[PDB]
Design a protein around this ligand. Structure first.
Ligand SMILES: [Mg+2]
Ligand SMILES: [Mg+2]
Ligand SMILES: [Zn+2]
Ligand SMILES: [Zn+2]
Ligand SMILES: [Zn+2]
Lengths: 110, 242, 291, 337
């Protein structure tokens, strides 16, 4: 959806709002945008550097910084702060999707 | 039947000889095999499969010939067999002389001949010929000593044929194959006056023989030069005495 | 989904609108199918009669052959195409006022098959038969669409299609349930049609030498129930159908059987008929049916 | 001439990216239409030759977004489209993408209901799983050779596949290898039950060679650089030296070492019945329980185990006694005289 679509909140439970089907899809797309679009000062990719790291040392973890995401999209950072039980699960899936986009067929490694 | 003392030869058997019928009443549509009868659903592709229950007919083309001495045209049952299968067989006989191998192509069936041609020339070239004749072809998993090899030409082939004989020593001291062996040694980079004249002439002769071999050995019929074109070669300067 | 089914459905609904048979000198040319649709709206009936001759005329009869050879396969596509056509023009009659079932009947087939002419290669195809009515049963309801009550999270699923045999709703009113072991049917949300079985018999003139008479069971589904009295010669038009038979257990010949565990099931059947409609062969009504 | 301007270096340009997100009111079916137009737009530059990247970078000029193509008209803080002005990195809309594609005009793609039906006569109905499995066709698994009609109108000519296990021995590959052998044998066959170094074989070959020395010398004398025989009529020999080993040198080395049917067959059909396929599985050896003139007599259209009995067969004798079969031959026979 839109950035302000997440801002307009209407649900009885905060985690239910996060896991609202349309809202959940919006969260997935917005996280995809945050990871694919955010770039360092010198034009070097932040998430590009992280995926370059992951491709060669083949770890099962990615060191995603909270501050850069916060100045990227405040609503998603606040969703993480209030209800990290659900967004992290989505963020793992979108991270895997982006890794496949850069390095396809990563199932055997991890 | 060739006589050496006369130095001349004549053809005799015409047993399977066929009179060229009226082919029709560019070259891509010359022989994609759509001629005479049968002339002029998507989403399903049998690229990597053979039907379990087969409900279709085979090509019905003449297969007359010999064990070996058979052209790619007839070998793959390619329609509208042309006269140039004969010159292909001629080139096969020619190559049999250059290498001293009489049973040059021991083909117990069509498959043997096709695989032997694949060995000599290459999978890609044979596939290209089949595609030219509107025919799909595929082969994988098989191991070849020359994987799409011998692309240098037939020179390397007759070269290692003679190489193993040289290492063994099959040929006699007076065998005339040794001059050819030296020719390939020199060209592959791998009193005396009469000697130098003689070797110069044999350089030229072997040269022209090897560039008429590749002239005849080409899968394309339309590109394959006719018998008169073969006779017009610079190798055939002895007809010029007329 | 099937591309061919979509093609035949779209062609069906296309010529339900584009078709127009001439009225010769008197009346110019009119849309016969649209005229019948207007008649349907006027009289609020439930069955549409389609001549097979017109379908044969249209598009060199390729579609006619396709629908005659595989009528059963294309029948749902026919229903969907007719529903969309009704939606296009006069969609008021779409609903019962929950949903009104539209019946399609084909009439005037080129040929007539006698009861002894029944063949297995015609199973599922469209044809016509001519016999004498021997036994007629009561008009009984049949489960057009069936609703049930759930086992875990006891609740009622509403308006689920019922096939030729008993069906269990894979989905549940509660999406989290996904349990279907024990369903309890409810008549309120279960649709019904009219069912009646008529045992026809071969006419005398068609009997071969020595053979004793042969007979067939014909099912009349829809408004055509109780349309024929016993002892009358009627022409039945419908689809050739098969029904499971348990009696032919000792007959000669290998019995087809399905193995699945074990999953054994004897695939023994007997031939029957499902007829779209039936045609038989004061002084005012009498005076009307004269030239 | 803009196409030439836009066919100049983008074949060498290596940076391609396409923006995904946008701020619009889009429905699920509208989402699907967006996805299909997005994949078409991706394919538009997929074959262009310019490599595509998945990340937004200040290097990648190609970036297309539907809305806010420098259309925000205001400062933004966390927008790539806010940086698009400062980085100069080009941006269009998808409608503007089609506007520019009008310069390119790339095709959208690179009915006969009766034909559809009688084609579904083949393959069965087309409503199957779009996968590599149909069970109606033996898909190739092992090393194989396959040659097929391009239009699949005729049956495949050669279709042979071999299990890996039977390929264990290199000597008897079903497809022969270029095992050259020696002594002028077939290049695809070798010295089976033969050894070129076997001293008895060497002696036999040496004796045969020395027997034929004079004949080979006569051949060379007859044929030496004059391109003709009668023209050659009026120096004895020319020997070009070589480092090659021959029969004589190898023989000297060894001596030093030891010093201390018919051709015709009946025409056969192509299609084999399914019952034939079933029968062919149950095949076992014939030893359980119960001269060379064997061939096919096309005159009698019959296959004979023995010729001497076929010639005396009743049908063949009757055929021979009928001159009506040879009338055309006699017509040209008499024309000789
Ligand atoms: Mg002969
Ligand atoms: Mg002959
Ligand atoms: Zn051809
Ligand atoms: Zn439930
Ligand atoms: Zn005979």
């Amino acid at each position: 959806l839109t950035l302000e679509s997440l801002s307009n909140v209407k649900a009885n439970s905060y985690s239910e709002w996060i896991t609202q089907p349309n809202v959940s899809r919006t969260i997935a797309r917005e996280l995809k945008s945050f990871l694919l679009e955010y770039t360092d000062e010198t034009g070097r990719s932040v998430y590009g550097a992280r995926i370059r790291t992951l491709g060669e040392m083949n770890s099962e973890s990615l060191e995603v910084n909270y501050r850069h995401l916060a100045e990227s999209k405040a609503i998603l950072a606040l969703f993480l702060a209030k209800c990290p039980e659900e967004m992290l699960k989505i963020f793992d899936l979108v991270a895997m999707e982006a890794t496949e986009l850069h390095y396809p067929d990563y199932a055997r490694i991890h | 039947l060739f006589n050496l003392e006369l130095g001349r030869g004549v053809l005799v058997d015409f047993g399977l000889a066929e009179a060229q019928m009226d082919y029709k009443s560019n070259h891509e549509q010359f022989c994609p095999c759509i001629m005479r009868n049968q002339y002029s659903v998507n989403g399903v592709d049998l690229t990597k499969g053979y039907p379990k229950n087969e409900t279709r007919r085979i090509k019905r083309a003449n297969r007359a010939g010999t064990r070996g001495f058979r052209a790619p045209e007839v070998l793959m049952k390619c329609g509208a067999q042309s006269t140039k299968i004969d010159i292909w067989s001629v080139g096969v006989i020619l190559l049999s002389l250059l290498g001293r191998r009489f049973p040059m192509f021991q083909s117990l069936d069509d498959a043997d001949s096709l695989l032997e041609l694949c060995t000599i020339f290459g999978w890609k070239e044979l596939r290209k010929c089949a595609a030219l004749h509107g025919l799909g072809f595929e082969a994988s998993g098989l191991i070849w000593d020359k994987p799409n090899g011998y692309s240098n030409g037939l020179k390397e082939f007759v070269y290692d044929l003679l190489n193993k004989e040289c290492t063994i020593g099959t040929f006699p001291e007076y065998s005339v194959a040794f001059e050819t062996f030296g020719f390939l040694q020199q060209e592959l980079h791998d009193d005396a006056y009469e000697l130098k004249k003689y070797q110069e002439e044999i350089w030229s002769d072997h040269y022209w023989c090897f560039q008429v071999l590749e002239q005849c050995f080409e899968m394309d019929p339309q590109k394959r030069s006719s018998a008169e074109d073969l006779l017009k070669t610079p190798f055939f300067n002895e007809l010029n005495e007329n | 989904d099937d591309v061919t089914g979509e093609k035949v459905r779209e062609a069906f609904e296309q010529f339900l609108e584009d078709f127009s048979v001439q009225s010769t000198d008197t009346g110019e040319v009119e849309k016969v199918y649209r005229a019948q649709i207007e008649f349907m709206k006027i009289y609020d009936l439930n069955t549409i009669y389609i001549d097979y001759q017109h379908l044969s005329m249209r598009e060199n009869g390729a579609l006619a052959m396709a629908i005659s050879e595989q009528y059963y396969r294309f029948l749902p596509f026919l229903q969907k195409g007719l529903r969309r056509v009704v939606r296009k023009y006069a969609p008021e009659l779409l609903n019962t006022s929950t949903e009104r079932v539209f019946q399609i009947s084909f009439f005037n087939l080129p040929t007539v098959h006698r009861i002894r002419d029944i063949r297995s290669e015609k199973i599922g195809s469209l044809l016509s038969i001519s016999g004498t009515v021997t036994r007629t049963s009561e008009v009984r309801p049949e489960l057009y669409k069936a609703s049930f009550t759930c086992d875990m999270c006891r609740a009622i699923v509403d308006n689920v299609e019922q096939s030729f045999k008993y069906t269990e709703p894979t989905f549940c009113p509660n999406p989290s349930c996904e349990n279907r072991a024990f369903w309890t049917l409810n008549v309120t949300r279960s649709r019904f049609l009219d069912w009646q079985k008529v045992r026809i018999q071969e006419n005398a003139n068609e009997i071969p030498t020595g053979s004793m008479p042969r007979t067939l069971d014909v099912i009349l589904r829809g408004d055509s129930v109780e349309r024929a009295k016993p002892g009358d010669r009627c022409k039945f038009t419908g689809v050739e159908i098969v029904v499971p038979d348990v009696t032919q257990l000792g007959l000669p010949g290998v019995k087809p059987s399905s193995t699945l565990s074990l999953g054994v099931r004897d695939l023994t059947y007997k031939i029957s008929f499902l007829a779209c409609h039936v045609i038989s062969i004061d002084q005012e009504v009498f005076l009307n049916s004269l030239s | 001439e803009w196409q030439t301007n836009w066919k100049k270096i983008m074949k060498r340009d290596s940076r391609i990216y396409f923006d995904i997100t946008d701020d619009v009111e889009m429905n699920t079916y509208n989402k699907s239409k967006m996805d299909k137009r997005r994949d078409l737009l991706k394919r538009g530059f997929l074959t262009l030759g310019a490599q595509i990247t998945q990340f937004f970078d200040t290097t990648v000029t190609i970036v297309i977004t539907r809305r806010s193509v420098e259309n925000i008209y205001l400062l933004k803080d966390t927008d790539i489209l806010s940086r698009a002005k400062k980085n100069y990195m080009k941006v269009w809309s998808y409608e503007k993408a089609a506007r520019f594609l009008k310069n390119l005009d790339v095709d959208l793609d690179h009915p006969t209901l009766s034909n559809l039906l009688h084609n579904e006569k083949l393959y069965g109905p087309t409503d199957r799983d779009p996968r590599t499995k149909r069970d109606d066709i033996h898909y190739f698994k092992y090393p194989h050779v396959y040659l097929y009609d391009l239009w699949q109108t005729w049956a495949p000519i050669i279709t042979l596949e071999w299990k890996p296990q039977e390929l264990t021995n290199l000597d008897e590959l079903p497809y022969p290898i270029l095992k050259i052998g020696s002594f002028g044998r077939c290049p695809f066959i070798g010295d089976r039950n033969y050894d070129e170094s076997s001293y008895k074989r060497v002696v036999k070959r040496y004796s045969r060679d020395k027997a034929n020395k004079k004949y080979a010398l006569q051949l060379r004398a007859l044929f030496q650089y004059h391109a003709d025989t009668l023209l050659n009529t009026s120096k004895n020999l020319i020997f070009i030296p070589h480092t090659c080993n021959d029969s004589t040198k190898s023989f000297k080395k060894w001596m030093q070492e030891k010093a201390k049917g018919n051709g015709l067959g009946p025409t056969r059909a192509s299609v084999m019945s399914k019952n034939m396929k079933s029968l062919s599985r149950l095949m076992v050896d014939r030893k359980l329980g119960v001269v060379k003139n064997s061939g096919y007599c096309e005159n009698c259209r019959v296959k004979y185990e023995s010729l001497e009995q076929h010639i005396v067969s009743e049908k063949h004798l009757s055929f021979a006694e009928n001159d009506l079969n040879f009338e055309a031959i006699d017509s040209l026979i008499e024309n000789l005289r």
